[PDB]
Structures are given as structure tokens and as C-alpha cells.
Symmetry: D3
Subunit: 157 residues, 6 copies
């Protein structure tokens, strides 16, 4: 019945993302993780790799599924008969560009956005910073699921 979409590029998914997935899956009947792909810029991981890494670390969430898309998020959401987005937030600054997008999305499509504070322990990991730290050899094994860490090191080598 109820449902929410958790969007991102997830390149790769982090433990901060997984925390948000788990919290959304606990509060909505269904959750769709939307892996949003830019057709004009390849990330580090292909779409299939991104989805596989997410599925492997969400196997214990029976009401969660993972799908890719592109274009307007609100179309992805509405085409699935839903009208809620759930996004994780770390800071007041995150709240301002995300605020702009949430109000635009409500304006153009009537889709609501719910924000959740990520857990303190994952508050400083981002996909981008984990990739940058790993590139120059820093240890990020505690910030990423097992489904990700060594695949990341493999990409870098």
C-alpha cells in the first residue's frame, strides 16, 4: 500500500545509504531504491554493478527492490504509483540544495520528500569521498558494505 523511493547514483552504495534504506523499509510497505544513471557520464561502476552491490547488502529487507532509471526522478516515482521520496541528510547545507529540489518536485509532480538524519557513525562517508580516499590508499573498509569494498579496490587497481 504505502511506499517510498530512495534515489541516488550509488556509485558505490555506502553504509550511510544502507542505513537510510533500512529505515525507509521499516516505515513504508514497499521501498524502491532508484539507481539514477547519467547517460552522458560513466561513473566508476556500471549500472549492473551498482545494483548488484545494493542487492547483496539488502538481502534481509524483503520489501525493498532495486531499479535503475534516468531523467526526472518524479517520473520514476509516479510511474510506480508512488508519490514519496526518502533521502538521507547529513548537514544544514545538505538541507538547502535538497530543499530547492524537494519544493520543485512537489511543484511539478505533487511528490513529497521525506528527509532522515543519517546515523552518526556514517555521517562523514559519501560515495565521492570514499572513492577519493581509497584512490590514494586510505582505509575505508568500515564505511562500505562487504559487497563494495574489495570491488572498489579492484576498480582502482
Amino acid at each position: 500500500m504505502t511506499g517510498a523511493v530512495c534515489p541516488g547514483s550509488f556509485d558505490p552504495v555506502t553504509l550511510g545509504h544502507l542505513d537510510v534504506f533500512e529505515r525507509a523499509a521499516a516505515q513504508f510497505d514497499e521501498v524502491i531504491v532508484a539507481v539514477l544513471i547519467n547517460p552522458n557520464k560513466a561513473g566508476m561502476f556500471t549500472v549492473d554493478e551498482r545494483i548488484e552491490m545494493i542487492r547483496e547488502s539488502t538481502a534481509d529487507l524483503p520489501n525493498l527492490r532495486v531499479e535503475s532509471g534516468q531523467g526526472l526522478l518524479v517520473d520514476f516515482v509516479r510511474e510506480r504509483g508512488l508519490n514519496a521520496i526518502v533521502k538521507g541528510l547529513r548537514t544544514g547545507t545538505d538541507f538547502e540544495y535538497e530543499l530547492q529540489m524537494a519544493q520543485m518536485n512537489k511543484h511539478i509532480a505533487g511528490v513529497d520528500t521525506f528527509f532522515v538524519a543519517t546515523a552518526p557513525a556514517y555521517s562523514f562517508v559519501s560515495s565521492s569521498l570514499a572513492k577519493e580516499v581509497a584512490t590514494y590508499g586510505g582505509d575505508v573498509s568500515a564505511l562500505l558494505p562487504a559487497s563494495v569494498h574489495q570491488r572498489l579496490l579492484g576498480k582502482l587497481r
Copy 2:
């Protein structure tokens, strides 16, 4: 059966609050609006008056109910078999509210979902509406119709 609690003093409820209630009621199977009773600061409206104003404003939300509460919010939430709070936000306070959300998650496993106010209601607050009205300012576009009527009576 999903559910969330929308907490506040609501003294009085504003259209900003109502917008949050509507969005919560659209996304959860049940919503409870929790009206704080505070033994120290007694504001402008009694708890009963505040509950009545909220019920009038939410008459079209069948899955939303209004109740008073006291003490620790997460106790109120867990006592009703729920473990989610929904709160409206205007600015990045994402900061004091963030502290509270992480504290509430830590002590009781209760999650908090924040939603941005509609742009049109982003500058209204109960306190500022009362202050403006006290001096003859017109805040009728920022409050439910019934609240505005009741507010003018308390000022006379």
C-alpha cells in the same frame, strides 16, 4: 499498518502545520498529532482548545487523530506502537532538530522524517503569528479559518 506521530505545541495550529499533517496522512496508514501539555509555560490556548482547532482543520483526514501528551516524546510514540516522528522544517532548524532526532533514535529506536514546508507557509510560526496579530497585523492567510476567528477572541 504503518504510522507516524506529528508533535508540537500548536498554539495555535498554522497552515504550515496543516500542510505537514496532510503530507504525513497521505504517506502513512495512521498519523497521531501529539499536542504537548507543558506545566511551566502556559501559552495562549488551552490544550483542549488546541486539540479542537486541530480537529476542525483536519476534518478531511480520516486516518489522522489528535491526542495530548506529556514528558518524553519517544515514550508517547512507543506507547502507541509506533516508532516514527514526522516534523516540518523551514531552514537548515535542521541543526537543533538533527540533535534531537539522533538523540531520539539512540534512546528509543524512534526514527524522524523531516519534510520541507510549502513555500507559501515557510515564514509562518505560531509565535510570530500571535505577535503580529497582537498588534493588529493581518495573519488570516496563514491560519486555518477557524483558528483566525478564535485568535481574535483571545486578543479582545
Copy 3:
């Protein structure tokens, strides 16, 4: 003989910008909208100027001009020393703050910031272009003229 300059790329001008123009025009005798030439945008400078002129026809004390280089030189060369800029958030206040203090330091030009109308809090030229590109309806966020012009650039 008061006056202020309202700067931007305006690619395209939005109703948020127009709101700021109207407020500046209501409080200063003379307003100049300063359109940056910075050549990777959607509209040419001439088109951007046209769209602003079209949308500001009811503001007799406002004119529109293009410029390059330091904004403070554009302002001072026209005998003014005030900039009027619209602001949506505290984050915008901090980087605009740095610029405002730099501009005051190097040229004695003051910067006045005004809050967006609540209804345009979330519109920007770039987000409007992005949403429209993927088929979203931004007609309520742009001057009627601009909206038709945008459709023409995408189709």
C-alpha cells in the same frame, strides 16, 4: 539621484529575478540590470537582454545592459555604488558575503541583499532549464515570454 545595479547571467531570467528587479526599482531612482557576458549557456546575451526588457516594460526606471570583467567597474562606470542581489538561503549569504566584502574593499561599492518571494524560493535558471529539458512544467516560474522562448530552444 539614487541607483543600484542588479547583476546576473539571467539564462534565462526567472520570476525570482523579476521580483528582485521590481523591488529594486521601487526603492531606487535608477536600476540597471547587468547581464554578464561570460563565454557555456543556453541563450545569447542579446536574447537574455531582450527577455529581461520584455518582462520589465512596466518598470520605467529600469534599463538593461551587458557587461564583462569586474562588476564593480560596471557599477562605478555608471556613477553608482550599490548592488542589489536576491538571496534564498543562509548558504547563499556566506559566499555572496565574501564577494560583497571584497567589492566594498576594492571599490567602495555596497551590496544590498533581498529575500526572494516565498513562491519563487526554489526557482533558479539552471533548475528551470533542467526540469524543462526533461518535460517538466515550469510555466508558473518564468515570465510568459521567456517560457515560450525556452520551449523553442528545446524543440
Copy 4:
């Protein structure tokens, strides 16, 4: 016939306030400093007005008046519809933002914010009073007149 109102409690007026007054006076034909009567402060309204008048003698187009109630009524009753307020941080921008939007909504009064001079970024009436109370030297942060007056209230 342009004009703006600069509001505050000014208890006492600081060099940060004076900087904002001077900037408002340079860009508007008429400036009114609006001193709130809100009776728990250090100086009486008359003393606060005196200190501002003393510090603004070189600003011929500025006057100082006391008021109560809604600031927008003070502004409108004098035929104006602009407020000029100084800002130090993004945090100040957000609660002042709420007020500015409320004031625009209820009375059509616009609010222009200006960044403090860097040198007065950290001075406020309350922090100056607090520091002086415990013996700290705030003489570089207040008009010469005000500083002597403050010493007299503490001793």
C-alpha cells in the same frame, strides 16, 4: 523621494550599527533610525537616541525616532516601505529572513540586508556590555561618546 528605516534596540549603538547607518544614508534620500521601546536594558530610550544622534551628526539625511509595536507600522506611518538591516552570518539571515517575509506579507514593506564591515563582524551590543562589565577594552568597537557613557553606567 527614497527612504529606509534602520531598526534596533541599540543598547548601546555600536560601530557596527553606525557602519550600517552610514551605508543606508549613502544610498537612500532619507533614513530613519527606529529605536525600540520594549520595557530589561542598560540605557533608557532617551539615552540611546542621544548616543545615536551624537554619533550620526555627519549624516544630514538621517534622523532618530523611538517606536513600539509592529515595525511595519512605524515604517508605513512615515510614508516609507523599506527596512535596512545589518547581517553578520548565515544564521542571522535565516531568522531575519522569516521576519522579512512576514513583513512583506502583512504590509508590503521590503527588507534590504547589508553585510557588516569585516572589522565589526564580532561586535554586538550585548557582547560589548558583557566584556566591558568584566573589565575588557571595547573602546575600539564603540563610538567615542558611547564608550565614555558605558563606563559611567558600570562605575
Copy 5:
């Protein structure tokens, strides 16, 4: 030789404070914890209680000592032949009022302020919020040192 002062009301000290003490003690030759007392408002704990709770949870920091004071912090600092303050920070908002005070303190006394980000795990505890939560019965045992938690519950009962 080198030295810093860690100020606060510490009513009571939290694990967030202790983290900051430990980090200052690791980077400066001596650290003084300055327990600042308002003679015009009693807190929950008396000065002696505050100091005892701090000493008991800093026994393994040999270069740290604890002293109370009042009035201007910069006088406390300079009277001890020091000119640095170390303070913990959680948010961008914390950085703004603290910024104002740091620049005032440099202006009036030449004293520098160094800020450190508290550990993620303690980022949401404050003395005030711990007291408020404990007052209404919430479990804050993991946010306070052993020297504090039951003494706090005792004050409340």
C-alpha cells in the same frame, strides 16, 4: 611549554567533552579544564561535584588539570601564562556564535581559539539535552562517563 585551556560549564561533563579533553591533551604539553561558574545561577551540580566528575574520568591524562573560575575566560587563560583555548564543535551554527566570541577574545586579549570536531558518536549529546532527557526518564548511560550517570540520576531523584 605549550598549553591550552578547555572551557565550559560542564554541568555535567559528557563523553563529547572528554573526547575533546583527550585530543587537546594529546597535542599540547599541558591542558587546563576551566570549569566556569556563574555566581548568579546555580546549575545542577556544585563546583566541587563538577570538578570531581571530570577528574574521575580524566585520571589517565597526566598532563591535564581541572580548575574553576568566573568572569572573562581570557583572564583565566592569561593568568596561567597561556594564550590558547580549545573548544569542541558540532555544527556550522556552533561555528557562528563561537566565531563571534573567538574574535572578540583575540581582539581584547590576544588569545587564540582552536576548534575541534567532536567524534561522530558524541555529536548529539550536550549537557543540557542529557539532563532534559534524563529528567523525563530517557536512557543516557552511553553518553556520559561512569563518574556522572548515576550522580545525575541521584540529583533528579
Copy 6:
């Protein structure tokens, strides 16, 4: 023997940077200014030129030395037997810098101490000073005297 590293690109060093260097040198037994070499973005001055400008500006700081570095900052710090970074801050970025500080603490046990810029230098940055100077703006009050001389030469 206490110590800290002050990292940056310093392209060129500003009076804001120098103020941070001076405060660090006053509070730690040794300070190392770490000048980043970045293979991708080659800015206005070479690493050697940047080191020379910093050494000129810090001639009166005997316990401060200047070195170039590459890659992970915490490796640079630990390789020199230190575990503290000192960085200057202008605004609440306390946010991206906070993320980085917590990351650096997590991966290598290196702490970060932030200090507020002097009010007078709070709006200067290397990037904005270059941009202003490129168009004939006068930034001589915001840079060390020698930097200003060298900067005018690169623009000609």
C-alpha cells in the same frame, strides 16, 4: 615535541593563510606548511614559486618549515611523526571541512584544529584575489608584499 601541519595549495599564499601560520607557530613546537602538488589542475604558480612565496612571508617563524606533498594528507602528516592538522575557517566551510576532519580522524587517527581567520582577512581567498587582480582590481592589502609583486608579473 608538539607539532601540526597546515595544508593547502597556496596559489598564492594570502594574508589569511599567513595569519593562520602565525597562530599555529605560536601554539605548536613545530609547524609544517604542506603545499599540494596536483598533477591535474596546474594553477598560476609552480610549487617551487609557491614555496618561495611562503618562505618569504614566514621568515620570522623559526619553528615553521615549508614542504611540498602529494596524495593523502594524513600520510604526509604521519610520515613526519605528527598527528595534527591546523586549518583556517571563514564560515559555517565548517561543513565540508568537518566531513574531511572526521574522515581523516577515522582513517589515520589524525586530528584537525580549526581557527577563525582574522576579521580583516576573512573575505580573501587565493582564487578571488587572482580573479580580482586579473581585471585590475587592487588586492595589495590582502597579500604579502612579495606575493603582490610576483602576481603582477604573472598577469603581464
